[PDB]
Structure 1
Amino acid sequence: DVFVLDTSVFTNPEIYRTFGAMETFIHLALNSRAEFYMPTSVYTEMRKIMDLWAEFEMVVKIRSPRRFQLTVPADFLYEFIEELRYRINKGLRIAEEHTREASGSEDVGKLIARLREKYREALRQGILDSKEDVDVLLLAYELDGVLVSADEGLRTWADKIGIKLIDPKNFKNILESL
């Protein structure tokens, strides 16, 4: 199986505990005859995030999204655009509440982190956040492989697009059982 693993399954506390952890993963991921194939943009974003790397690049092939030959359903974009309005409005309401709180009391160093967390939770959790996730979705919908990841939005979009999903907390056990 061509497992299309994203960065959420490679660099994350839950991902690392379930599967530093790169060596313990590659102990059996390169085995079991499963040709993992990660996106190239996902690899670049992971490298920008955090990081033997040349050996980890010798198992999962960093391929291109190949969006030229790929097409997306119209409903798959309508459902994204419908949730985008709700997420943006929730973020705007959170910002308005933060401004109202700052009007009365003044704590910049405590309000800035809270506002950043609220924005990142209400506008980047539960939906496709970046282009590095759309690339993974397109690669999975093109290679017809597994879509091991941990993002709720990525999983709920891959399920709505027809991609196959395998439990991230079970990816290590699945790879070790094949």
Structure 2
Amino acid sequence: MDTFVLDTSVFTNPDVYHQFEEDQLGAIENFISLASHTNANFFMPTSVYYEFTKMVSLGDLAPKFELVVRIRSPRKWGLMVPAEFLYEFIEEVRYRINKGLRIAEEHRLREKYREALRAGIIDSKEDVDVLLLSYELDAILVSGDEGLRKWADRVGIKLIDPKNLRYIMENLT
């Protein structure tokens, strides 16, 4: 059985969700439908699912989604990880925090600095939840975020072109 960890970008980036349907809620509905007939496991971190529910009005599709996708918190599960990954992660957060500062520079600036760095911290956390969950399960990471795909590849994690999730699932009935 193939296991897949899904990012929010899967259902919020039209270049990805158009393979299911051009309509966003219909794309998700089609994903849910196909998943229930696919010989595969699907996981999404809890932080990422919280973001997904905050940005898309799922309505009745939420409890349907909760029948096909395992929503898990890799932090609350207490994983062990090689010390080299812990320092790779810190470099990734450092770099993300510096991006947040260059962003605040392009925009007193107190108000702009606090919000740019808070977003960069939250981005870092959700990314690590996605990479830890993939690592723990030895799963295929599916993401429309090229930056997270490069990060997953630096640490050996398996990927697909997220534009081929539907094609892959259909060849896994």
TM range (shorter): 0.7 to 0.9
Of 124, 131, 136, 2:130 maps to: 136
Q: Which runs of 5+ in 2 are unaligned?
A: none
1:40-65 CA-partner distances (Å, limit 9, x unpaired): 22111211122321111110011221
1:58 aligns with 2:58: no
TM (norm. structure 2) is 0.73
Task: Give the distance between the partners of 1:66 and 1:86, measured in 2 at CA.
Answer: 22
Q: Which runs of 5+ in 1 are unaligned?
A: 100-114
1:156 aligns with 2:150: yes
> Identical aligned pairs, as a percentage?
67
1:175 aligns with 2:169: yes
Amino acid at match of 2:149: R
> Are the structure 2 counterparts of residues 54 and 97 from structure 1 closer, same or farther at C-alpha, using a change threshold of 3 Å?
closer
Are the counterparts in 2 of residues 66 and 139 from structure 1 also a CA contact under 8 Å? no
> Are the structure 2 counterparts of residues 86 and 3 from structure 1 closer, same or farther at C-alpha, using a change threshold of 3 Å?
closer
Of 26, 30, 36, 2:32 maps to: 26
Are the counterparts in 2 of residues 45 and 132 from structure 1 also a CA contact under 8 Å? no
SS of residue paired to 1:36: strand
Query: How many angstroms does 1:159 deviate by?
Result: 1.5
> Are the structure 2 counterparts of residues 28 and 98 from structure 1 closer, same or farther at C-alpha, using a change threshold of 3 Å?
closer
Query: How many angstroms does 1:140 deviate by?
Result: 0.8
Are the counterparts in 2 of residues 3 and 147 from structure 1 also a CA contact under 8 Å? yes
TM (norm. structure 1) is 0.71
Amino acid at match of 1:15: V
Amino acid at match of 1:54: P
Q: Which structure shows the bigger proportion of residues in strand conformation?
A: 2
Query: How many angstroms does 1:32 deviate by?
Result: 2.2
Larger radius of gyration: 1
- Quote the residue 1:14 is aligned against: 15
Amino acid at match of 1:22: I
